[PDB]
């Protein structure tokens, strides 16, 4: 199999959806450029930055064992066995960075707790992962999706919107989120007219009718995914219904949802995961090409797929001058979370080495037989640090986890006109005038 | 490491506490003769009997991969990695037989569900293992300890004992059992005077006083372990209190508990796991000696430890004529459960091969890429068969599992005089005149 194995005094395992879930027969499909290639390179970028940082793990070199998940649960577990074979050629696995999808992260967390291997995910937002009776070694730099509920209800409780109607998607997201919203609304005196769930355009048209049948609530709180949100706005367009929507990140600040139904959408309050681009990362990512990137065994497949050419005769040959640049690259939204996950692990290990190895920077016999239980509970859960590549080194650039290992809730608010950043929800709400 | 690896068309993995949990530093201590050696040999005995049985898996040879757990959770998981490395030299692991202790079985179940490997335990009685949201691939031939509660309360509800007092041990056993009793008593109108829990002889003496403080209940339902039960009867002896005890298998029909306090114990109704000895097994077990048993790599250690001699110079040499016989061997209480667990797996696989391989006895390509999900839910959970070595082939010799994979509740009742078998509790109660 394909992998990135780089020796180090301590090794962080990594799991990324380098490939899309394979079609019917096959395990893996094409290369996931954004969630796969970029997120993987952001790990390598952070490891490289930590290994040049004399104030972080000055005498401990970080190594990596990066593996593809193929955006599948089973494939990720088979791969994860490398991290656990080690725990017993396999390396000194101090922790695991990943995965992306929550189904992957859940299955990996299930294997990892058995061997006391700390795990930080940069993208898995399911609420299930907050259950420490099941995922006791899991932590994440991204907040759980249920925090959007707390935030959305605060946007209502500010604007005193007490009589509100709700629509929710089917599955883990909609159901766990809306249930969290209901409970947070009940806590803040807010009432529900109709709780419509959604598993044909006529089905969404039926939901709009039930939303009209209670004309008392103008405010409709939405906790749906992208495709669901887009077809319920077109369903509100067909019936020409005028509702002020307060939607989750499934809608967010994207054009996909509002395409051809802009009129019915005006003045909708949406949520989006606040993230700041890692500038130094853009420079590193764009500098990569098949001539300089031999350490990534997927980079040639990535390149060949991106530029639709062959590096190697009925295929068109790749131009030696092709480049990842401003015309074809835009930093993936979760890069900041990948970098912060890697550094949280580095910060935890650095405080551990500092404590367990008095009068040395080097990995002493105590750290050599790593107590994962101690690393997670005593170091990882107790670290707070300014994000490494955040320009404004303020209180909202602090990387910390609550008692459940969940990252800090940081969402932005977006008004519709044209999406406009009308505020944020950190621990508390913030809005302007729109 | 030490192991029993025997090739077969299908392989059953096995886990047994061959060694006692090691002292402080060490992982493994001495050889557990009864729960380790015997239970392991009962697996090998059943595999041998199935491989001679032309009506059970006629054209599929069962192989084994038997490993030591060292009566530890971590050691069992490290070993279990052999079963999962296979699932991907490692063999075709169709299922796992074990472990003994519930902490071992819980940790193994946690690894095994990930790889869809069915698991049958012959001894793990914890209630936690009935939770299919956690242990979805686990089943057991032994019933969960909480069934004793249902049975004990029926002994009260027969004799109309409605005003009853309770004492419970600390930990998984006492607490889960007594809570199950309370709920089953509340269902049957029975009331509780004092619910005394127990984590010094004076501490048990305090409990007896609280039991006296409510002189209304003569009946005291006990859900404690052996050591706890023995010190609460001596505590009732010191204070000279006369209570009719209705106790769980922690007390059962053993002399250990009643030693020096026989008077206070008279007329106590105790529970014990009903099991019938496997006669053909006694013949096989006693026939074993270091000359004929090379397949068990622990048998020389077992022998050397049992007879306190060396097979190999300051140690006394083993007499070539020493033998496991009536003077030193008594079939371990759970042997029947080991044999039944192995056969339930064989019966499940046989019905699977029969269905998935029309017009052949041999392992066809469908069975070669085994669906553990199907084997467990569709075959293992749906098998019912007369116990292989049970003389009276009646309805109480049926090996079956409920929807949670739990084996059939079969306990015996024991009156004190001298312990006397005064009845049984199968699905319903049965008693005589005593
Ligand atoms: N938030 C995610 C999570 O699984 O927690 C969900 C998926 S996105 C998706 N695709 C279909 N439904 N949802 C992935 C996102 C990311 O990789 O940024 C994580
Ligand atoms: N019933 C058991 C289970 O763990 O389910 C409990 C232990 S016995 C024990 N020793 C200390 N406390 N309890 C073991 C018994 C067996 O091997 O027959 C299984
Ligand atoms: Cl993933
Ligand atoms: Cl979902
Ligand atoms: Cl065990
Ligand atoms: Cl216990
Ligand atoms: Mg450094
Ligand atoms: Mg046969």
From Swiss-Prot, chains A, B:
Q: Name one GO biological process term.
A: negative regulation of adenylate cyclase activity
User: What domain of life does the UniProt record list for this protein's source?
Assistant: Eukaryota
What does UniProt note about where in the body, tissue by tissue, this protein is expressed? Detected in brain cortex, thalamus, subthalamic nucleus, substantia nigra, hypothalamus, hippocampus, corpus callosum, caudate nucleus and amygdala.
Annotated glycan sites: 160, 240, 359, 384
Q: What is its main location?
A: membrane
Q: Which UniProt keywords apply?
A: Cell membrane, Disulfide bond, G-protein coupled receptor, Glycoprotein, Membrane, Receptor, Signal, Transducer, Transmembrane, Transmembrane helix
Q: Which molecular function terms from Gene Ontology are attached? A: calcium channel regulator activity; G protein-coupled receptor activity; glutamate receptor activity; group II metabotropic glutamate receptor activity; scaffold protein binding
All ranges on the Extracellular side of the membrane: 1-434
Residues reported to bind L-glutamate: 102, 123-125, 173, 249, 334
- Spell out the disulfide connections: 28-70, 309-318, 357-364
Protein's cellular compartments = Cell membrane
This entry carries the following GO cellular component terms, namely: astrocyte projection; axon; dendritic spine; glutamatergic synapse; plasma membrane; postsynaptic density; postsynaptic membrane; presynaptic membrane
- Identify its protein family: Belongs to the G-protein coupled receptor 3 family.
The free-text function statement in the UniProt record for this protein reads: G-protein coupled receptor for glutamate. Ligand binding causes a conformation change that triggers signaling via guanine nucleotide-binding proteins (G proteins) and modulates the activity of down-stream effectors. Signaling inhibits adenylate cyclase activity.
Its assembly, as annotated, is:
Interacts with TAMALIN.
**Protein name in the entry:** Metabotropic glutamate receptor 3
Please name the source species: Homo sapiens
What stretch of the complete protein does the chain hold? 30 to 495 of 879
């Amino acid at each position: 199999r394909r992998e990135i194995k780089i020796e180090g005094d301590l090794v962080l395992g990594g799991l990324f959806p380098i490939n899309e879930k394979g079609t019917g027969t096959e395990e893996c499909g094409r290369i996931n450029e954004d969630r796969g290639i970029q997120r993987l390179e952001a790990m390598l970028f952070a490891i490289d930055e930590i290994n040049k940082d004399d104030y972080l793990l000055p005498g401990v070199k970080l190594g990596v064992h990066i593996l593809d998940t193929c955006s599948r649960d089973t494939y990720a577990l088979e791969q994860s066995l490398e991290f656990v074979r080690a725990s017993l050629i396999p390396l000194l696995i101090a922790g695991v960075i990943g995965g992306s999808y929550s189904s992957v992260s859940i299955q990996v967390a299930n294997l990892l707790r058995l061997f006391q291997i700390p795990q930080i995910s940069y993208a898995s937002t399911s609420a299930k992962l907050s259950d420490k009776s099941r995922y006791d070694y899991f932590a994440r730099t991204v907040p759980p999706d249920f925090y959007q509920a707390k935030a959305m209800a605060e946007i209502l409780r500010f604007f005193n919107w007490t009589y509100v109607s709700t629509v929710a998607s089917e599955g883990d997201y909609g159901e766990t989120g809306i249930e969290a919203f209901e409970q947070e609304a009940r806590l803040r005196n807010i009432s529900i007219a109709t709780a419509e769930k959604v598993g044909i355009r006529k089905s969404y048209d039926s939901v709009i009718r039930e939303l009209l049948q209670k004309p008392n609530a103008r405010v409709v709180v939405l906790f749906m995914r992208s495709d669901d949100s887009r077809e319920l706005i077109a369903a509100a367009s067909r019936a020409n219904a005028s509702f002020t929507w307060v939607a989750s990140d499934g809608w967010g600040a994207q054009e996909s949802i509002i395409k051809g139904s802009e009129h019915v959408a005006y003045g909708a309050i949406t949520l989006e995961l606040a993230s700041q681009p890692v500038r130094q990362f853009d420079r590193y990512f764009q500098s990569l090409n098949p001539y300089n990137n031999h350490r990534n065994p997927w980079f040639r497949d990535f390149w060949e797929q991106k530029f639709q050419c062959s590096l190697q005769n009925h295929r068109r040959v790749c131009d030696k001058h092709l480049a990842i640049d401003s015309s074809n690259y835009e930093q993936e939204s979760k890069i900041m979370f990948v970098v912060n996950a890697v550094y949280a692990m580095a910060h935890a290990l650095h405080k551990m080495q500092r404590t367990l190895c008095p009068n040395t920077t080097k990995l002493c016999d105590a750290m050599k037989i790593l107590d994962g239980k101690k690393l997670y509970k005593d170091y990882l859960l107790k670290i707070n640090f300014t994000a490494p590549f955040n320009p404004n080194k303020d209180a909202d650039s602090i990387v910390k986890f609550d008692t459940f290992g969940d990252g800090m809730g940081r969402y932005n608010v977006f008004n519709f006109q044209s999406y406009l950043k009308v505020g944020h929800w950190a621990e508390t709400l913030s809005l302007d005038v729109n």
